Design a protein around this ligand. Sequence first.
Ligand code: UOO
Ligand code: UOO
Lengths: 1290, 89
Amino acid sequence: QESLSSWIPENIKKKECVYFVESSKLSDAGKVVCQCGYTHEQHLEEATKPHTFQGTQWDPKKHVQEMPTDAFGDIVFTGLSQKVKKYVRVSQDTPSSVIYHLMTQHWGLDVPNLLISVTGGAKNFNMKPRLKSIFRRGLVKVAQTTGAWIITGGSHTGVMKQVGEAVRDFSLSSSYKEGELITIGVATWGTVHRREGLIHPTGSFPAEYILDEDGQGNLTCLDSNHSHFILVDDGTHGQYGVEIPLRTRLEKFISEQTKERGGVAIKIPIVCVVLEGGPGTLHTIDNATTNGTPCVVVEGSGRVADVIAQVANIPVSDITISLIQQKLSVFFQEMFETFTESRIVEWTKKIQDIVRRRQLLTVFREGKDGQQDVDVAILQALLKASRSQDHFGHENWDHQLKLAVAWNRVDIARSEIFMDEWQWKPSDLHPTMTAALISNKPEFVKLFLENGVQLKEFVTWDTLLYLYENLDPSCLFHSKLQKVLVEDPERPACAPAAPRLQMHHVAQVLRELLGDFTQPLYPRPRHVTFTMDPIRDLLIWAIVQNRRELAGIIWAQSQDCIAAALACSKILKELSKEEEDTDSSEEMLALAEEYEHRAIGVFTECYRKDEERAQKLLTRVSEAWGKTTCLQLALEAKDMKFVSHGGIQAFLTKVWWGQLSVDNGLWRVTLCMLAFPLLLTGLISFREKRLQDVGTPAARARAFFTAPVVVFHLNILSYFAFLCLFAYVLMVDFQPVPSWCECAIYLWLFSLVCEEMRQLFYDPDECGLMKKAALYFSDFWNKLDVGAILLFVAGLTCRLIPATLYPGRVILSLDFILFCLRLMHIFTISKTLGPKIIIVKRMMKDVFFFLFLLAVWVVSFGVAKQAILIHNERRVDWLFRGAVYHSYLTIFGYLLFTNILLLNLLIAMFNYTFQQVQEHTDQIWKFQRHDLIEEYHGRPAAPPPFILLSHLQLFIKRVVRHKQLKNKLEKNEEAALLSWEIYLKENYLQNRQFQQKQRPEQKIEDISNKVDAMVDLLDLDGDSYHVNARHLLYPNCPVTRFPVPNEKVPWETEFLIYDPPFYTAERKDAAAMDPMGDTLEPLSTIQYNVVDGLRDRRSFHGPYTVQAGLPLNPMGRTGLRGRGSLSCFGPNHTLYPMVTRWRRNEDGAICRKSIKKMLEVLVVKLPLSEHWALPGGSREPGEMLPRKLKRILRQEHWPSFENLLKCGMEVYKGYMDDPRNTDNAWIETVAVSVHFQDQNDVELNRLNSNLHACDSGASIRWQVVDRRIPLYANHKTLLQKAAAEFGAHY
Amino acid sequence: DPIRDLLIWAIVQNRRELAGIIWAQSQDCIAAALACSKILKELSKEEEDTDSSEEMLALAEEYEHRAIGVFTECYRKDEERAQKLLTRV
Ligand SMILES: Nc1ncnc2c1nc(Br)n2[C@H](O)[C@H](O)[C@H](O)CCOP(=O)(O)OP(=O)(O)OC[C@@H]1O[C@@H](O)[C@@H](O)[C@@H]1O
Ligand SMILES: Nc1ncnc2c1nc(Br)n2[C@H](O)[C@H](O)[C@H](O)CCOP(=O)(O)OP(=O)(O)OC[C@@H]1O[C@@H](O)[C@@H](O)[C@@H]1O
């Protein structure tokens, strides 16, 4: 609103009538109306001055002045909706660039993918409800699902009133994006009812407007359902012909613009629709159709549109002028008598053209055939005309696909594009596949992947780099990627001005998210080159920015799908906690829980086909995911439902024992560990019976110390025996000379901390030392283990000086109590009491306050016990013992409060947090098992009493991870394992979809969807005369040629209205022929049917009719008589040479289409023409035509040789249809075709060396012969005739 | 606020379907949705009936959920600005 009010008045300007002509005609009791028609005695309301020289009368040029616009703002239509709609006020001469810039940037509109235009008559009309609902629904759907502009008129009467009505109908529901059907309106400012309440300079912000129908004259009121208005000025009061020219110019300039989103660029398609127009719609339809807009006329309730619908598929030129007159005399009752005999001619000619081209013209057929929702009909006509456009190199296919992907309708893609036009090698769909992936279009990616594009290909290094650059610019990954991009300093070292994206940048942040333990996925830098597993990277690109539907589609064809499915959950959980959101932070946390279930469901499929091979893939280092296993990812990703599957627990129980069998029990293990000579007999069990039957006595002894459960039992027994020994010395061995167990308690308490060196020091994955310390501090059990030494802190001095008996016993006794509390951790192994200790560790909290609930009142009643005794006494020492005894007696025995009031408080505080923990404790404990299992696997194989032998032996190895949970497999076997995994994943996905389609809700939805199409089903139930030479608007000539219908085109035919303007060339004198544009002076002396020297007067057609000294066109009356663009008065001779050879494959043989050969023809275009033409021109020299014909092509020396070789085959000679043909001058052509039989040598190499076209102009190029080859309309008729020369397929 | 008064007129005499339609376009819709429940609970205890006294006590529990569901929508778009409307006269 600040930079908008500035960019309006000093570039846009308004017309005004400065001069003061009085009123030639006074109308409707008004004298202020003067020609143009504003107020005041003068023509306008400006200063009443002589206004420079007082030249009589005014000229719309001399006396129209352009001054800056003063009216603009946000119109509000009183109480009829509060929406605030923009409006600007312009004039005739404003370039469309200014309006486009304003409308795109300042107004805030977005560039559309389609420009639908609504032009129609303004006489109010009323139409049947069926067609009415069809039009409304079709227009709204086609204009909402594509985000198209609906540019139309701004009046409140007619078709534009109908479209305002349809926009209101859309706003009635407005399921989402209510203010998205933006409809810019174009109307004349000079004819508005309440326009004086809008003229406010330097900002008419919310300028209220009042609409009142049946209160005007011929002027018009504004609409209320449009979104934007652009009003045009002319300094006129009652004219209606000023908005159409500017609208056509702007609408033409819009289609020139190109939209580039996702890597594919298209020029905006442009479509037109009409509904019962009047006299000016036969302007707009012609003006649109001649350009190439797919005009869509609707059959039904039509004054004009119904005329085209009626005369629509009846073939061209089969209609007579009288037939058109009788067609028109049955529909126009009001003015059937005011139709001039010349008004028929214009309509006949324009209907002739429009209905002649049926490729551009399209009739709706409201209910007969093709009676769809109108949206697909409009799109179908648009793609018809797009297919009809020029294309040389298979461009129609790619353009139509690009446009379909630009829109969001897959039905169009599959029913028009992907069904037809052949070919489409799967590599061809790659460029648009990138845009489909970038714009998040899952339907189109499914369709493309159906047609043959393989995800194994199309993921190149370049393509991946392109995709990461165009990542969604609203993502946490985008922000962090930008940060790492800018923070790397020796990357800008080469060029600090521009930051360059590379592959390692995404890899670093990916490692940051996924974990330290993995190596970077993409190696540091140090044609098409795929990386290993080209699907994992596309899977990352799809997962990171939270693309649900793309994610499953890409994961459906992954190499390894347990590791990938778990990494996808780890990344999501890591990136779903520091996002600072509540919508996507909740969406990703739920998508992670779904990839969790994907990983779980794929693995149980493998665990049911086999047992031993279902764990070798559980523990195998993956080279495509950071050199990590499938178990460490789940354990570190907090996957609570995967590590407690049962197939994971069996594998953990198996390593909990080792190489020995599990179906033995715990009692037998204790019996054997207690009795050392109890393993050589048949008591303990074994698996892998090769060592059980042939039992090695040496291996049997080593196996138990290898097993970790034996190590755990030795540790627990050693710790318990230590604790008993400490109790023993607490009892009786307490001598000032250190008892035989003082050094022993020191050393065997060091036995705990020396292993703590191993637990704390070891870092299987690269982790910081301070992180290690923080992790150690975060453990409350480790805090108790440290608190053992913490209560040592007061014990060593008490031992050193043993006199402090009374203070010092308590320190060591509480140290014993803390030792016993630490002993309680042993039950985590116990399956039945492990989770039970887990819940008790959360039970511990309630005691801290139930103690304040119990002890305080117990002590209070103990106080009352002494208060009962005696009142006043002074014995601090004695009352202490007395109160202690009383409290002890009360505790031992009070019954009213202990058993009744407190007990249920306790039981309830228990049971509240007991309830609802049955489900989660199992998962928690089965998760916590692995840490202890791995710790005891990493522990040494010696009892704590003796473990010093290994503590003194693990130093020489260092001076000069294990294969149980992480190992490398052999590649040949790994390939078979991966193929087995692929087969089982396919089976699992297939079963999953088959079983999910059977849900009752899905079945009900299927019935509901099936009944709707069925409800829809039940509810629904050539003359050969010249044509180009007869078009209106003679090229580059302001005067328009008089319309001549095909009925009276020949000279001999009856005709009575002949009045064409005398055609005048720009410079007829320099033609070197008769300059007589007007035949007043017959200076020309043309020797008819004879040679006249410099100017040829001999025609190939033959003796033509001559009258009044003006040569008559033999073909017929073109409609314009005069000098013409042709050089000479009368016929002009030319020759068009063509070089034709059979198009050849790599073998050199003639190439075949389905029908016949291909001809290869050389064509040349110059940039200014914007069309292709044969290298032929007017034969200025009589002796040597080719020199002037193709002087810019050959050499004139090489073309002297070409003239020596100029002896070929004569294809066509006779009259030519050319747009310059006036009634006086016409063009006749000679066609010579030189053909090449072999391509080894001769004239081909002669022309190759015979080239001087490099002097100037554009390129000279060979071409194929095709129906859509870009050439002039009838200049290619010569080539079409030449097709018969050598059996050509068109 | 020419809608709050029509909302009172619709709520007081227990007009279910009119009540939601009028509340759909209210200025402030946590305070209004809570006052509509307070009025209903106050006027649904001294009515001397069993049909409408039970209908209004259930309509109050529905404007309760309307007020709750509107506020969690504000509490998920922002954190600090979702309480400045919680405490504003
Ligand atoms: N908003 C208006 N626009 C054009 N005329 C209007 C308008 N309001 C009124 Br009041 N009238 C007058 O009526 C004209 O004098 C008509 O002659 C009268 C009968 O209406 P029609 O004859 O049925 O329709 P056309 O004359 O063919 O003009 C079609 C135009 O061309 C398209 O590009 C669009 O800009 C327009 O729709
Ligand atoms: N099949 C056609 N053959 C020749 N002209 C054609 C043809 N169809 C069209 Br429609 N035209 C019109 O001419 C275009 O509208 C141009 O505006 C006219 C010239 O402008 P250009 O396009 O730049 O030049 P050309 O068309 O390639 O050849 C013109 C040569 O040059 C002049 O001196 C003349 O003596 C020669 O005929």
